[PDB]
Design a protein around this ligand. Structure first.
Ligand SMILES: Cc1cc2nc3c(=O)[nH]c(=O)nc-3n(C[C@H](O)[C@H](O)[C@H](O)COP(=O)(O)O)c2cc1C
Ligand SMILES: Cc1cc2nc3c(=O)[nH]c(=O)nc-3n(C[C@H](O)[C@H](O)[C@H](O)COP(=O)(O)O)c2cc1C
Ligand SMILES: Cc1cc2nc3c(=O)[nH]c(=O)nc-3n(C[C@H](O)[C@H](O)[C@H](O)COP(=O)(O)O)c2cc1C
Ligand SMILES: Cc1cc2nc3c(=O)[nH]c(=O)nc-3n(C[C@H](O)[C@H](O)[C@H](O)COP(=O)(O)O)c2cc1C
Ligand SMILES: [Fe+3]
Ligand SMILES: [Fe+3]
Ligand SMILES: [Fe+3]
Ligand SMILES: [Fe+3]
Ligand SMILES: [Fe+3]
Ligand SMILES: [Fe+3]
Ligand SMILES: [Fe+3]
Ligand SMILES: [Fe+3]
Lengths: 400, 400, 400, 400
């Protein structure tokens, strides 16, 4: 275990190997960690657990730290499998140990473990749990951030906010604190996490943070459920979350597509050229969805003021990877972004119009589409390049 | 080169390595071949070329077989990149050599090569091209089988049908003829090809074959553009195409899904059990679309009387791989098949209803959906197992 | 659960999703199953368990079949994680239940579970365990087939041989018996399993089967730990094991390589041509190790009389995937096979000689190597094709 | 095209999609570019070409910039396929155009293209080529940096060094110059390139740079063949090459392994713990070679003072991915690094000793190995953790 602060002990688990989260929809290229915390005052409190894969390691490591019978309270901020996966194994040893959680957590815990006989304690915002030595736990409900059962736990005196998933990131390192790791890699994992997971709940982020700030609770450290502990200027991640929640966008355009004979690819490259020579302010990224990291594409979409999506017509519909990606974007609900569909066709086409409509369904403000037949020649590439010019002028943040 | 029959020489190319066709939407697990043919009578005729990757090998191998200036006619049955990719390199050496093709082929050839100065000869069904020694080529238009430019070329006397893509398969072998290869692997590649490529054009297959049969043309061999040459009972593949085109289905049910915590997986397995114990006649296959070969899933769908598709609710929509697969099935237009959507959810759900509707859009006759919350317990698995029973009884080909 | 025969119940688990075994060194393209059996006579005996992934399901399904306290004996034929993974979870409920296994199994069970306080019973070949109703279990030691702890359990009366890994295969199907599944797929998975796993233990196969046959024990069914139960002509898989163990080879040559600019690939294709035109009897397979299924290559190697391995020179050594594959072949110990190293180089080369030596280390009888500089021209390809001729004539099983 | 400086025009090609170089041994996660340059003074000089994939685009784009007959000289700094792939297509239009290159380049050009009838001009260090307007090209031989044919071309007046592969990186961006792109991403791609490609030629780097500096030639820009053009403080990449060539290492330890039951993984994690609590200065990275990016592991190895490699015993040999990686490291020739082999075994083992020996063959100074049986218990993990302590104390750059 690792000492977080005073009697707060990190009893979590590092995961150097993990590459797949949420099925295969989240790629953790830099591993992850599952942070659990054991507070040892007059009362002994365990906060969250770890992933199911390390259930047996978690209990044994917990035994080495403390006798399991001496654990007074268990706090579950969130009942996902990567935080409550090792709960059943633990409760098999100490079944009478009370669990403090939200009302919705009772539904989610019993939903997976099927053990309603456990001693649950419903907590709501403002409720306190005394642990002795002048210290107490304060619970703060955060529904749909990013689950209905989600909440945070604050420890007075030590001024530590156990925020669970919030302000966390999938980043595995031997060092525990934020000032001990690579800042660039840390920022990348943080933004990647928010973009792919927390984007559709952005409307709830700012009012919830504003509510918490009103409590006037001092914050020395922010101990999340994933990655580093924020101890050096810990509110820096809170400020990033405030920026990212306000329909975040940079002067940036992301282009992604799928192609069978690179005809649409040629269109994509030509569009990008037109943009660059019209608006030097705009940063442009190009991706082949069949050949690229999906989460990286989505992170760029999150950072972009607008996107262009390319697809060829395949059996009168669009290419499935493009279709799948558009479906996911519809769930993420990007805001204040604009889009334009493009692609090549053989005869009757139809996929480009089909794509433009589904992009509109995803919440994008649509501009005119760009269509081309077979392989674009020199004249056709001019029209594609011209299309990029028109997009740049329309989506300009400022004149010229 | 290899002797097909008499003065017919296979001057094509084997591809032991190829794994990706049509971007990444067709997996060739057993490689492929690109069959080109050189007929040497009084006239010298080249029929089709090969993939663009082997353009330089093709011309050189062609030089070793014959002086390029001695090539009298070039026949293009189909102007795709895996058949007309090496055309530009070839025509760069013999630009005055006439090209015989369909009217639509002029649009597709010029669409990729951008060389309209070539000497094109529009051919239609019934047209002949004499090559001497009492032999002639007969052209047969086959629009939308599977491209608008598609046609077949028949050689009299030798009774050889150059069918291009039709009756072909992606199967690489040192032996050229069908009776020289593994029959099981051959059948698998044939059915895989039809299911993933030719399914939406099934309505055009039977009338076109019936039209060709009316010509009363003897068939000794069928020389396709991919895989083996059919010489031993060559009409066996024609009969398979007739069977596969008639909205083909077996007493079979395919179940596929994507899952994040295996909750939907548990539902899938429970459904399958209910089916097996209700209708022993039904063959059941189960796939995880994130962990399986996509084309294999589609081949099973093609063979199935009905399917069940599973997805969890992710950001109020369905999982993208399921969405992508449903989009592709909408293009393939499966017929006389039935479907049922299922999956697990956390709170409000909605993905299952969303999936059922899109399956209906794909042409499936929909049965009732199956929904479950979180991880299915013993009682919940009973309902899933019961759902499989109801599906089996409804989709029964015969009573009991 | 499923009735195997009389009071024998299959209480195992199907795995439709599994694709990776032994890390990533075995690909199960058709899933797998983990077969556990519950015999209910006067005594109740459980034979083996399942993979750790389905541990909670295994125990729960076992409860639905019988009260856990009514389980009299537990038989562990083999203590691997895919057979003894759910042991700890089970023994946590019934710790006093005796375990019957080999002496080496005590080391392997305690090696993973760390529960030496369990009540182990060492069994040896010929030892019996009465279960009532005139029936008894007979244990047969099979060390290094394929583990030191490996054994088989025979049930008298019902004449059922519980062979564990032996005669098994990774094949998932809703039907349990061999006469109920696809015979071609069954054969493929059986041979694939033997080639990649049981090849180095081939010398031990024949004497052990001969020893078992000497017991004159009637065999009605063979219940393995993976895949189908052999009930219809169960000795068919025994004869296959006898054939495969005798340094199995067909008139077949497998060629595999890795390449950076397809120079070595061009050599590979030319070699294959030389073989085919010299010995038409020989079947030839070509693989790119970077683009193919590794286990399929090894299955072909197992079936081949000889192989040719290709590599280019990379930093004065060979390409890593070739190095890795040769290392694995060194462990598999193929017998009575011949080999030839080939490949392209830029200047000083050396990788081909390095490869030839390591192939000799793997047990292959080496023929002359083939070297070429850069991209092989027409003259160079003649030498490559000529090399295939020389190899074909040398490795001929019969003249011409 | 893009203006580099004055009459120097970038006529290269961006590659947003490329992910595989040298077969599959180099992963370009951020794409790449192929830089070609057209100098238009009194004479017109083309410097290098692009990859074969963009050959038709290269020639066409070149036509749009200038009439091909007006091209006076062609300079080939390096005849690899990603620099000379489009040479044949170009020379097919202007065969009489002279080619300036090293003596070894004649062998490498003719080795691939097979056109020795081309007009080659052998150049050596110090040789000049006048292009008018007071400007001239100066050639500098750089054999085995990183090919025998490799050289650089310097343009007087404009003070531009065409370094080809040297100082380049695989990084695709719409902006051409180094001060216009993300500095962190640029540094990562630069170091990644050197570590995986230029490491074994490090002994040649420093003397060659020293030789060039002796020429006292002003360097305003460095135009490479891959990635950005260095115009803003161009000597920053030169200093990095000087640092990286001097047997570069940081206070860092990289641990990588392959595992079948995570037994070796448990050992790896325990070792890392022992190191971290013994020497807090040391940075530790852990990788599973079957689940990680191979090039990233090698970049970490390059940056590390020492490594620990893990493998289990599989058929009396080591796991193939470990074998393959060690083979590649043997070619890369890392210097002044130390190593320790570890891993789990079932009975007789042997793979750990086998690995330790091959690590010694790769040039690592070996410390004692670490062996464990089956799954490491609490006592075994103590020894593993203790091993990390012993390694940390031994490999310390400074006391404590
Ligand atoms: C499998 C397949 C299906 C196709 N279906 C259609 C279609 O339904 N309508 C159409 O106009 N073109 C169709 N085409 C032609 C392509 O749209 C055309 O080749 C396009 O220009 C190539 O796009 P890409 O290279 O950018 O992927 C199809 C092509 C293929 C290979
Ligand atoms: C990223 C993510 C998004 C989710 N979105 C929703 C949602 O929008 N509505 C809902 O009811 N449940 C949602 N859930 C909960 C899952 O649907 C629930 O855990 C389900 O039972 C698990 O399905 P599976 O394990 O079969 O994939 C979400 C879960 C995750 C991980
Ligand atoms: C990264 C790299 C390293 C190389 N190292 C060597 C070498 O050490 N010795 C040599 O003779 N050639 C070397 N070469 C040249 C190749 O061996 C040569 O290009 C070969 O003909 C190509 O083989 P392939 O296309 O079959 O992969 C190297 C090439 C590359 C790209
Ligand atoms: C396919 C296979 C082959 C094995 N071969 C050997 C062997 O030759 N010698 C040995 O001592 N153990 C052998 N073992 C046992 C492993 O070394 C043992 O399970 C080890 O502790 C697991 O290592 P890992 O989980 O780190 O991969 C083998 C295991 C498997 C699955
Ligand atoms: Fe979560
Ligand atoms: Fe989480
Ligand atoms: Fe086609
Ligand atoms: Fe085709
Ligand atoms: Fe086993
Ligand atoms: Fe097994
Ligand atoms: Fe190079
Ligand atoms: Fe290069």
């Amino acid at each position: 275990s690792i000492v977080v602060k005073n009697n707060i002990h990190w009893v979590g688990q590092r995961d150097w190997e993990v590459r797949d989260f949420h099925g295969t929809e989240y790629k953790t290229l830099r591993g992850s960690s599952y942070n659990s915390y054991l507070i040892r005052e007059e009362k002994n409190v365990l906060i969250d657990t770890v992933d199911h894969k390390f259930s047996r390691e978690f209990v044994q490591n917990l035994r080495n730290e403390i006798d399991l019978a001496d654990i007074d309270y268990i706090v579950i901020n969130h009942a996902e499998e990567d935080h409550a996966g090792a709960l059943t194994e633990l409760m098999a040893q100490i079944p009478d140990t009370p669990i403090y959680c939200t009302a919705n957590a009772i539904d989610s815990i019993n939903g997976h473990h099927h053990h309603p006989e456990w001693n649950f304690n419903v907590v709501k915002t403002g409720d306190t749990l005394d642990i002795g030595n002048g210290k107490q736990l304060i619970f703060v409900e955060t529904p749909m951030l990013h689950w209905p059962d989600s909440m945070m736990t604050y420890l007075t005196g030590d001024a530590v906010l156990f925020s669970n998933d919030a302000f966390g990131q999938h980043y595995c390192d031997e060092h525990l604190f934020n000032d001990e790791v690579d800042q660039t890699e840390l920022f990348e994992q943080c933004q990647r996490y928010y973009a792919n997971i927390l984007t559709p709940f952005s409307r709830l982020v700012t009012p919830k943070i504003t509510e918490i700030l009103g409590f006037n609770l001092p914050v020395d450290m922010i101990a999340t459920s994933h990655g580093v502990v924020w101890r050096d200027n810990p509110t820096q991640i809170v400020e990033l979350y405030l920026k990212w929640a306000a329909d975040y966008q940079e002067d940036r355009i992301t282009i992604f597509y799928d192609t069978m004979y690179n005809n649409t690819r040629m269109m994509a490259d030509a569009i990008a050229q037109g943009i660059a020579e019209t608006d030097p302010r705009v940063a442009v990224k190009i991706f082949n969805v069949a050949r690229s990291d999906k989460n990286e594409i989505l992170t760029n979409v999150f950072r972009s003021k607008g996107v262009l999506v390319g697809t060829s017509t395949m059996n009168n519909v669009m290419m499935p990877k493009i279709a799948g990606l558009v479906e996911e974007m519809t769930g993420l609900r990007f805001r204040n972004k604009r889009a334009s569909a493009f692609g090549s066709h053989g005869w009757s086409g139809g996929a480009v119009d089909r794509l433009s409509t589904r992009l509109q369904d995803a919440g994008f403000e649509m501009s005119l589409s760009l269509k081309a037949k077979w392989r674009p020649d020199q004249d056709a590439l001019k029209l594609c390049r011209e299309h990029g010019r028109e997009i740049a002028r329309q989506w300009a943040l400022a004149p010229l």
